Amino acid sequence: WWRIMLVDTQLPALAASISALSQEGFDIIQCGNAIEAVPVAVKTHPHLIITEANMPKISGMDLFNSLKKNPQTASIPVIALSGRATAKEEAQLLDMGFIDFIAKPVNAIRLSARIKRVLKLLY
Known part of the structure; x- marks a missing residue:
């Protein structure tokens, strides 16, 4: 029973990948922005x-920092998904504490394995 929250401003574009994860056994919680x-x-x-990573108004980094402010969520691992994925952006997010970084477009096989690796390591 793995609860996975996904936050993206264009969830429809990930519909394909999200469906594949459900099949994998992940319980996907979908959020359209950092506010909710x-x-x-x-x-x-x-x-x-x-x-x-890059969302208007409130970014993935802003969300990461906000999660660190609540003891309930401060230790939950966070993976960044980015449509830019410059070497500098990847390094900045990883240096900040993001547990992993994945460049879009998203590949369901790659995403699934990345999620599992982190879960195996932390839980």
């Missing part, structure tokens, strides 16, 4: 969080 993501994370306690 924080309160939802605090009450649903996902085992892992996947967030788009």
